[PDB]
Amino acid sequence: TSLDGLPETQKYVYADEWGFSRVGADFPPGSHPSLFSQLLPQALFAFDARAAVAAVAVPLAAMAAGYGWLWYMHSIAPVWQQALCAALIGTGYAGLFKVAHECAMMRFIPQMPGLQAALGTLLMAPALYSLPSWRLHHLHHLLHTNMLWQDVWGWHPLTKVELADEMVRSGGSGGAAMAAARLVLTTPIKLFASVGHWLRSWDGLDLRHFHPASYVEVLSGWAAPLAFAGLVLPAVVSAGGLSGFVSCYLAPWLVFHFWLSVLSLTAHTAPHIPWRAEGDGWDAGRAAVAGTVTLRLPRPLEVLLNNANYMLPQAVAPGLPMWSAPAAYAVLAARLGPYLTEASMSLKLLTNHVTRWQIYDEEAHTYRPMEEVVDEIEADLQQLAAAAQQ
Amino acid sequence: XXXXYXXXXXXXXXXXXXXXXXXVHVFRKXXXXXXX
């Protein structure tokens, strides 16, 4: 961790300065997250049908309510009513997508594996996502959490060195890639950068990345999104025209991607969480316990998202079901207390994420704003040009 | 029956009290209903 041994005063002033509640101390090296699976009571792993049907039915009810309203008042309503129904539908679908993510890791209904596979496929299709590819990318993420140059399926930060290289190649700060980075990680559109993730799935639609023994399974995975976008996105358009498309599909889609992106970005990024390269001090347990941030929401939001913010517990006990994630956290907070980091979703946090922590420099091993960093490295460009005198 | 008319705006009269102000204004002496 970045803030090593130091009294509670500087910890807490950093905490309320950045919007976190409890910052974290320092974890010993040489460990593994799967260790602390022994700190969990065995009753947490039990299956019950009540929570299952509740988790699959609450977000469905929210979605149905939003749609019934929106169709009852199709296009006679002003823009704010449309925005509110879109937000409701997007959140309901984020809940159903958390259920599908559970079925992808094989921990929702293990007794009926065919049924849980079919359910995950069905719930993932409307977001145009593939279930087998999702499983693969998530496993690869769990194996490489916070590893520099390797965690490509997470919010890999834009480092100073690659930026300097691109600026030396561009011959100035006016190129195309320059302005692209400029607007993507300086404006609120960052809270939607998850859409980039969506495009990096479909690994070129290239069966040459996978193991041959799995071709038929991967192909099938790609055919459920396509079939949707080939049989249902026509109907919608044909039955509502452009407007009946932008209000019935595109706005809930953008809301869902907001949820996905903000959840992940807040989860694994903070000024006191370093990104060590491989061989240079990367530790697995240290990165999965100390390098994680838990977001706290109002309980209505939580029960709508199926506890989608609680990510730390299911990284130490990958078989821990979804409805036991809150309780389990309370257990770990007792024993791993001094090391965890926590935050509450507020405006200050997102403003800091957008305006302050933009570039990651490894020498200082911290995040710094894009503009001051680029003008500093450009002044050093001028000074090496002066050093290039002869 | 019929409805008396007077092209003053063209006022009218029925056996409510229309006034097809040239637009429309179906006065009373509020079109929320549907036949069955």
């Binding site: 008042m73 199709h74 296009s75 006679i76 | 029925x14 409510x16 097809x20 637009x23 429309v24 179906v26 009373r28 002496k29 509020x30 079109x31 929320x32 209903x33 549907x34 036949x35 069955x36």
Partner: protein, 52 residues
């Protein structure tokens, strides 16, 4: 038969009535479509559901 009239209705083939006082309801038949058009564009300004 050779001379028609125009009326405004629901999609479900039901007349739209203008009920006034004492639940007395008046229908209409217009010898020009501009009149039904005026009636519907007046309906829209006080109820967008029926007019839609």
């Amino acid at each position: 038969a050779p001379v028609p009239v125009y009326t405004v209705a629901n999609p479900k083939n039901e007349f739209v009535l203008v009920a006034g006082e004492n639940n007395t309801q008046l229908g209409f038949f217009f010898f020009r479509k501009e009149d039904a058009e005026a009636l519907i564009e007046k309906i829209r300004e006080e109820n967008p559901r029926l007019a839609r």
